[PDB]
Structure 1
Amino acid sequence: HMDPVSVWGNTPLATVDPEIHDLIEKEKRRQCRGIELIASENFTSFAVIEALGSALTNKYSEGMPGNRYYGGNEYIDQIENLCRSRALQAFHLDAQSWGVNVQPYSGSPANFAAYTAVLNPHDRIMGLDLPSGGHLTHGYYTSGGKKISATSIYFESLPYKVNSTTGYIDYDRLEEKALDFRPKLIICGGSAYPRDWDYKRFREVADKCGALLLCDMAHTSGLVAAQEVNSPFEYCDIVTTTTHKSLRGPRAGMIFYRKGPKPENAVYDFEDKINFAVFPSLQGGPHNHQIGALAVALKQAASPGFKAYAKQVKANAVALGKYLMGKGYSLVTGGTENHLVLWDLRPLGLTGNKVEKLCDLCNITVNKNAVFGDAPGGVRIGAPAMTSRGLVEKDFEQIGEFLHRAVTLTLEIQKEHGKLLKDFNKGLVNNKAIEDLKADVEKFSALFDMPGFLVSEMKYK
C-alpha cells in the first residue's frame, strides 16, 4: 500500500528526516555564531528562501516564455518574464539595448553557455590569471600543461596578469598579449581583485585585436546594481553573473547580452545564440524555483535599502582595510574599491593556510589566496555577508581587531613551534589563547541579527 499523501508528502522535514533537519539547524547556528568573511558568500532574505522552497520546483518548462514545448506554463512564463524585466531594471539597462537569460543553473554554467553561444570549440579566450585573482571558469591550466578548467579543455585559454609590484591589472601587458595571442573573447571580472575594472580600456584592447568582450561580474554584481562601481554594461558585449554573492540572491546565473544596432546598419546577433546555447544545447528544463527566488532578489536589489547596503559593503571593506594597514599590515594595492580586501602575509613570514586555519578555529571564516600573481601568500576577506547582518564600520574595525589578534597568535605559534606546517599544527592543540578569541568572536557574532530565518525559533541556542 502506498503511503497517504499526508504521511510522506505533507509531513514536515523535522519528522520525515530528523537527521537532515538537525544538520540544517546546526548549519543555521554556525552561520550566525561566527564571523563570515568569505567574499563569495552572503546571507539571503527569507523571502528569497520562501520562493526557492516552493511548488515552483515541480514545473518542468523546457524552452522560454512564448516558445515552450508543452502547456501549463501560464504562470511560469509570467514569473520568468518578471524575472527578466526585473534583471534589466536592477542594472539600469534599456530593453531595446540589452536582453537577459535567467535560466543558467549557476554562474559557471552561465559562463560556459555564453562561450558556447559565441565561440567554436578551440577558439582562443583570455581571462584574469588565477594567481592574479581570476576565476577557474575564465581558464586554468597547470605549469605541466594539464588543462584544469573546462574552459581550457574545450577552448584555448591564455591568462593575463596583475603587475607583480603594484597588484593592479597590467593593462599594457594585457594589450601586448592580446595582440600576440589574438583571442576571440576577452573576459574581465574576477574573484580576488580589490580594485575596480577599467572596462573602457578592455574595450579598446578588444577592438584593437578584434575580440568579443565579456565581463563576469559574479563578485561585484550587487555593487553594479547599486551603481557603486564601474558598470561593465557600458563597454562589454556580454555580462554574466552568479546571483548569490554581493547580489544577495539565490544560487543561480544570468547572461546579459547587447541587442539592437551596433554603435553597415549592423545589429547585434547574441540574443538567439545565447538562448539556444542555454537551451537546447546545454540545459534541460530551467529550475523554476530558482527563477522565482531570483526575481524576488532582483526586486530587493532595486530598492533604496539595497543601494545603502552596497554603499555600506564598500565602506566596511575600506574601514577594515584601513584598520589592518594602521596595524602595519600590507593589503594588495594598499586598499580597496569594492567588497573585499586582499591581505598580503609574506611580509609577516606567514602563509595564507596558517592564518586561515587559525581563524577557522575561532569561527572566523576567510580563505587563503595567492597574491601579486606570485603556498598562497595571503588571505581574501569579504564584507558582504557580515554587512547583511547589519554590521557597520565600527563593527568591521572590531573584526579587524579579531583578525589582528588572530595573526598575532599565528606568529606566536610559528615562533614557538616552527615555520613548517607540520610544526605549526603542534601549536593549535588545546591552545588556551585560541579558545579565548573563539569565545570573544562568538559573543560578538551573537550580538547581530540574521536574515533568512528567525534566530528565536532555531533549534540550537
Structure 2
Amino acid sequence: SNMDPVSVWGNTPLATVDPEIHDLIEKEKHRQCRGIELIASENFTSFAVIEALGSALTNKYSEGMPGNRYYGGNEFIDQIENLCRSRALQAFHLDAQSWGVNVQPYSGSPANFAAYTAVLNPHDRIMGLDLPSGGHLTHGYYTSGGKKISATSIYFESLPYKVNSTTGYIDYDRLEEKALDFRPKLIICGGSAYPRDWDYKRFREIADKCGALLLCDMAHTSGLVAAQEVNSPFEYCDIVTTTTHKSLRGPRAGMIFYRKGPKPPQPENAVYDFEDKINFAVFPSLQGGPHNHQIGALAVALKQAASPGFKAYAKQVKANAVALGNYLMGKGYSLVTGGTENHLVLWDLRPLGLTGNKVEKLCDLCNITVNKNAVFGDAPGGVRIGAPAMTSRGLVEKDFEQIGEFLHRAVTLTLEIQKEHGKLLKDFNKGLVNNKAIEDLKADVEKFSATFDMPGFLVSEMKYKD
C-alpha cells in the first residue's frame, strides 16, 4: 500500500535490483575483453566517459539551445553544453567565427537526417556513395526493385555514385557527369567501408559546377580527422556530420558542424545561413529534449581527443590497419584498392569462392567479430575489418599481424568446411558443430585477447574473470 523507500528502489545497486541484467552485462564485459573486436564502427570508450554517461544528467529536460531554453533549471546544463560545443570546435581546429556546431543529435543517423531537414525541402535531390561502393544507409538506399529503404530515400530523391570498377577509388569523373545530369541539391561524401582518403577539393569543384551543397559524413574517421591524420572535410564542405562513438572514442551521439560568416565569392558580403536552420531542425523540428548525459560524456571525449595521446592513438590505428592489410595480402588475400589509408580494410572474398556470410559466421564462433560487407558489383562478397577497438586496448602492429594470422586460420577453416560439407548455408553449418579446429582457434583467440588491458571498466573487478 505504501511506496518503496527511496533507498530500496532508488539507491540500491543494479546487482541487487536486477541480478538478471547485472549478470548479462558482466557476461558482455567478459565477451569484450576475451575476443578480438574487429567491427570497424566499434570502439572501447573511457571510464571517464562512461561515468558522465551514467549520471544524474539523465534526469534533466532542457529543450532548446543554451541561453535560449524553453524553461529553467539549466544553469549547469547550459555550461556543460557550451563546453561540449567549444571543445568540439577545438578538437577539429575550427575557428568559431567560421564554424558552429550542434551537439544534441541522439546518434549519427539523427544527425544526418536533421542536417537534410535543415537545408532541403522534401523530395529535394541528394547523392551519396552507393552502398556496394562503401556508402552508408543514411546517404540513400533503394533496391533494384525500387523499394525505398533508407529514410533519406523515402523523404528525399536520392541517386548513388559509385567507385571506379577497376580501382575501387571514388569515380570522380562519373560523379561529376551524374551530378550534372541529376542536379542534386546536396552531395554527400564520407562513407562506412571506403578504405581510402577523400578528395574534398574535387568534391567542392563538382558541387560548385552543379550548384549543390556539400556535406561530409565523417562518422567513421572523425577521430583520424581530429588528430589531423586524414584530409579535413572542413576545408571544403558546407556541413560536416559525425557520430562520436567510432574512431572518436566517445559516447553514442552525433554532431552537426556548419559554416558561419562570409561565403566565398552571388550578392556581395553574402553570408551562410546554416546555423539557425540546423539548430531549428534538431529542435523543435525533429528531436525533443537533448540527452544531457550523452552531451556531458561527449564533452569528456572531446577533451580526451584533443590530447597528444589521442594523436598517437590515431597514428597507431592507421599503422595497425596497414600492418594487418599487408599481412593478409602476403597470404594471397585481396583487399579493395589494395590497401588502406584509414582505419579499416575491405577484404574481397570472391577470389576465394567464399561469401562474407561464411567467414563472419565462422569466426564469430571463434570470438572474432567482423562484418560481412558488400563489395563492388555483388550474399555480401567481402568482410570489413577495423583497427580502432583493438588499438584502444593497446595493440600495435605485430599484435595486428597475429590478428592477421588468426584471420588466415579462420578463412582456411572456412574453405575446408565449405569444401567438405558444401556451399549452401544449411550444408556449411554442418561443419560448425563440434569442430575441434574451431574450438582450438577460439581457445587461441581468447588467450591472446586476455593478455591486453581494457578501458572503461576494471578487469580486476569483473564478475567473470576466468
Q: Aligned partners of 1:194, 1:124: CA distance in 2, in Å?
A: 26
Does residue 422 of the first structure (1) align with residue 426 of the second (2)? Answer: yes
**Displacement after TM superposition at 1:342 (Å):** 0.3
Please name the residue that 1:283 is paired with.
287
**Aligned residue pairs: how many?**
461
Give the drift of 1:390.
Answer: 0.2
Other structure's SS at 1:61 match: coil
CA distance in 2 between counterparts of 1:375 and 1:74 reads 53
Whether 2:433 is the aligned partner of 1:433: answer no
Contact 1:129–1:373 (CA<8 Å) still a contact in 2? no
Per-residue CA deviations over 1:361-410 (Å, capped at 9, x if unaligned) read: 10000000111243111000000000000000000000000000000000
User: CA–CA distance in 2 between the matches of 1:65 and 1:243?
Assistant: 21
Hey, what's the Cα distance between the residues in 2 that align with 1:280 and 1:52? 24
Q: Is the 8 A contact 1:124 1:155 kept in 2?
A: yes
SS of equivalent residue, structure 1 residue 100? strand
**What pairs up with 1:4-23 in 2 under 5 angstroms?**
4-23=5-24
**1:291, CA displacement in angstroms?**
0.2
Query: 3-state DSSP class of the match of 2:187?
Result: strand
Deviations 1:415-447 (A, max 9, x none): 111122222111111100000000000000000
SS in 1 for 2:194: coil
2: CA distance, partners of 1:179 / 1:420: 44
Q: Tell me if structure 2 keeps the 8 A contact 1:165–1:372.
A: no
Contact 1:113–1:282 (CA<8 Å) still a contact in 2?
yes
Q: Who is 1:60 aligned against?
A: 61
Could you tell me how far 1:449 is from its partner in structure 2? 0.4
* Mean Cα deviation higher: 337-346 or 257-266: 257-266
The answer for unaligned runs of 5 or more in structure 2 is none
Partner of 2:315: 311
Alpha-carbon separation, structure 2, partners of 1:228 and 1:345? 29
TM-score w.r.t. structure 2 length?
0.98
Q: Report the secondary structure of 2:251's partner residue.
A: coil
Query: Does structure 2 retain, via aligned residues, the 8 Å contact 1:161–1:373?
Result: no
Q: How many angstroms does 1:264 deviate by?
A: 1.3
| Residues 262-295 of structure 1, C-alpha deviations (whole Å, 9 max, x = no match) | 1911100000000000001011110000000000
Q: Residue 434 of structure 2: SS of its match in structure 1?
A: coil
On the 8 A contact 1:43/1:451 being kept in 2, the answer is yes
Q: Identity over aligned residues, as a percent?
A: 99
SS of match in other structure, 1:99 = strand
- Structure 1 residues 73 and 449: CA distance shift in structure 2, 3 A: same
> Residue 340 of structure 1: which of 344, 352, 376 is its match?
344
Distance in 2, matches of 1:229 and 1:192, equals 15
> Which runs of 4 or more aligned residues in structure 1 lie more than 4 Å from their structure 2 counterparts after TM superposition?
none
Confirm or deny: 8 A CA contact 1:212 1:237 kept in the other structure.
yes
Q: Which of 376, 380, 388 pairs up with 2:380?
A: 376
TM-score, length-scaled by structure 1? 0.99
For the residue of structure 2 that corresponds to 1:436, the secondary structure is: helix
Structure 1, unaligned runs of 5 or more: none
Distance in 2 between the 1:178 and 1:380 partners? Answer: 28
What does 1:39-438 correspond to in 2, within 5 Å? 39-262=40-263, 264-438=268-442
Shift, 1:43, TM fit: 0.2
Alpha-carbon deviations, 1:67-99, whole Å to 9, x = none?
A: 001111110000000000000000000000000
Q: Deviations over 1:314-356 (max 9, x none)?
A: 0000000000001111100000000000001111010110100
Question: Is the 8 Å Cα contact of residues 164 and 374 (structure 1) preserved in structure 2?
Answer: no
Alpha-carbon distance in structure 2 between the residues aligned to 1:237 and 1:127: 15
Query: CA separation in 2, counterparts of 1:117 and 1:346?
Result: 41
Maintained 8 Å contact 1:133/1:373: no
Which secondary structure does the structure 1 equivalent of 2:279 belong to? helix
Contact kept in structure 2, 1:162 and 1:373, CA below 8 Å: no
* Distance (Å, rounded) in 2 between the aligned partners of 1:350 and 1:198: 33
> Using the alignment, how far apart are the partners of 2:176 and 2:374 within structure 1?
23
Q: Distance in 1 between matches of 2:243 and 2:252?
A: 7
Quote how far apart the aligned CAs of 1:166 are.
Answer: 1.0
1:109, 1:125 → 2: CA distance?
17
- Which secondary structure does the structure 2 equivalent of 1:230 belong to? coil
Deviates more, 1:93-102 or 1:366-375: 366-375
**Structure 1 counterpart of 2:26:** 25
CA RMSD of aligned residues (A): 0.8
Structure 2 vs 1, CA of residues 109 and 373 (structure 1 numbering), >3 Å: closer, same or farther? farther
Q: Aligned partners of 1:455 and 1:190: how far apart in 2?
A: 34
3-state SS of paired residue (1:126):
strand
> Residues of 1 paired with 2:103 and 2:343: CA distance?
24
Give the Cα–Cα distance (whole angstroms) in 2 for the partners of residues 361 and 64 of structure 1.
47
**In 2: Cα distance, 1:372 partner to 1:447 partner:** 37
Give the Cα separation in 2 of the matches to 1:190 and 1:316: 20
